Design a protein around this ligand. Structure first.
Ligand code: C5P
Ligand code: C5P
Ligand code: CU
Ligand code: CU
Ligand code: CU
Ligand code: CU
Ligand code: CU
Ligand code: CU
Lengths: 212, 212
C-alpha cells in the first residue's frame, strides 16, 4: 500500500536540541530523510517553530514526498493534534515521530508501519535493560518494555482518542491518547540505537553509532 | 550506630569493565573508597577473581575499615551469598554494592543505610524517565522506578531470603531474593548520576560527571 502513510514529525517547542548537528546536519534531518525515502510515505507534516521552517523547505524538491507544516502547541499532545489537522484526506496510517530520535532504522520503521496497519496502533519498543519496579505512595516496592517512536496509528482511531481525552481529561505518559481507548496497541521490537538525543553525551553516543 | 554495616562489594566475573580506569583509577575503586570513609562501615567484603585481589589489599592500611575477600559464583546471586559468608558475626546491615557504579554519592549511601535500618531492606532508585509499559505474550501493551545499588538488607532477612529461594526456586531480576519474602522493600531516592558503567560511552559519561 504505497504513499499510504502521513508522517507527523515532532520538532517543536543554547541551540534547540533537535538542531544540534550530528556529524554534519541538524538532528531532525536524519529521521526526516529516512521517512522521505520510504515509498510507503505520502507526505510529511513537520511540527516546528517557523524560525526553523527553512531547515526543511530547503530539500522540498529533492524529495519524493509532500512537505507540510503546522504549528506546535503547548504540550506534546497539542502539536500531534496540530499535525493531525494537515494530513492527506485519505491517509490510512499516521506515523508520529520525534525529531530527537535521528537514528531510527528504515527496517524498524517498516516493521512498525506493518504492525500499525495490522493492529490499528503500534509503537516501537525495546525490552528495558534496567530493573524497574512499581513503587507505591509509601515508597515501597509493589515483562517491561521501553517505548520509542514512531507511533503508528490509524487516523480515525487517533481522532476518536483525541476526542475521548477532550471530553473527559488527562495526558500523563501510559498515556498515549490510545491507551485510554480499548483498542489494542502493538509493540514492535526495535533497536537500542534508536536512542533519543538530549545530553551531548547522547550526541557523543549518536556519533559513536553513526561511525559503527 | 557506628561500624554497624558490612559492605559486600561486587566486582567478580579486553579489560574487565569494573577495572577500566576512570580519569586515573580502576572503576571498582571509587565506590570502594566511598564506603571506606563512612564511619558506619565496619568491613568490606570484596567479590572478585583473585587475579584482581591486589587492586584492593594495596590500600588495606590507608583505610579505617577491615578488608575481606570471598570468591564469586556462577550467577550474580551466588557471589552475594559468597560475600554473605564472610561478614562480622554481628553486623546489623548488609550493604550490597555493584563495582560498576563508581559514582554513588556518600549522601545517597547514608540515606539508603538509614532506610534499610528503619525498614529492614532498602534499595536506591530514581524515577524512570523512559515510557515503560508491560507487554503481554501477544506483544500488546497491558509510578515506576529504576533500581540501582546499594541494596541494604539486614543479614538475618537476607539469609531467610536465600533459603526460601534455595528450598523452592527462581532468580530473575523483580527478583531481589527479598522480593519473594513478604517483608517490605523501601526505595530510597537516589541520583541519576549513579549510573552503571558498561559502554565506554558510559565512561565518556562517567568522566563528564567527575568533571562537573
Ligand atoms: N509543546 C511541545 C513540546 C514538546 N514538543 C516536542 O518535544 C520534542 C523533544 O523532546 P522533549 O519534549 O522530551 O524534550 C521536540 O522535538 C518537540 O517537537 C512539541 O512538539 N510541542
Ligand atoms: N557470577 C557473577 C556474575 C556477575 N557478577 C557481577 O557483575 C558485575 C557487573 O555487572 P554486569 O553483571 O551486569 O555486567 C560485576 O561487578 C560482578 O561482580 C558477579 O559478582 N558474579
Ligand atoms: Cu514549500
Ligand atoms: Cu489546514
Ligand atoms: Cu539521554
Ligand atoms: Cu590483607
Ligand atoms: Cu570463612
Ligand atoms: Cu550504559
Amino acid at each position: 500500500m504505497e504513499k499510504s502513510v502521513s508522517v507527523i514529525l515532532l520538532a517543536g517547542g543554547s541551540m534547540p536540541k533537535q538542531y544540534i548537528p550530528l556529524l554534519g546536519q541538524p538532528i531532525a534531518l536524519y529521521s526526516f530523510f529516512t521517512f522521505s525515502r520510504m515509498p510507503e510515505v505520502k507526505e510529511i507534516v513537520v511540527v516546528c517553530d517557523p524560525f526553523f521552517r527553512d531547515i526543511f523547505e530547503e530539500y522540498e524538491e529533492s524529495i519524493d514526498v509532500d512537505l507540510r507544516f503546522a504549528i506546535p502547541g503547548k504540550e506534546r499532545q497539542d502539536s500531534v493534534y496540530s499535525g493531525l489537522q494537515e494530513i492527506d484526506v485519505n491517509s490510512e496510517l499516521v506515523c508520529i515521530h520525534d525529531s530527537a530520535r535521528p537514528l531510527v532504522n528504515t527496517e524498524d520503521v517498516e516493521k512498525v508501519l506493518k504492525d500499525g496497519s495490522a493492529v490499528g496502533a503500534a509503537v516501537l519498543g525495546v525490552p528495558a535493560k534496567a530493573t524497574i519496579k512499581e513503587v507505591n505512595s509509601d515508597s515501597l516496592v509493589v515483562t517491561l518494555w521501553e517505548m520509542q517512536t514512531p507511533q503508528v496509528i490509524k487516523p480515525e482511531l487517533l481522532k476518536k482518542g483525541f476526542e475521548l481525552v477532550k471530553s473527559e481529561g488527562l495526558e500523563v505518559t501510559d498515556v498515549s491518547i490510545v491507551e485510554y481507548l480499548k483498542h489494542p496497541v502493538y509493540v514492535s521490537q526495535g533497536s537500542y540505537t534508536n536512542i533519543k538525543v538530549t545530553t551531548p553525551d547522547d550526541l557523543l553516543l549518536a556519533e559513536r553509532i553513526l561511525s559503527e
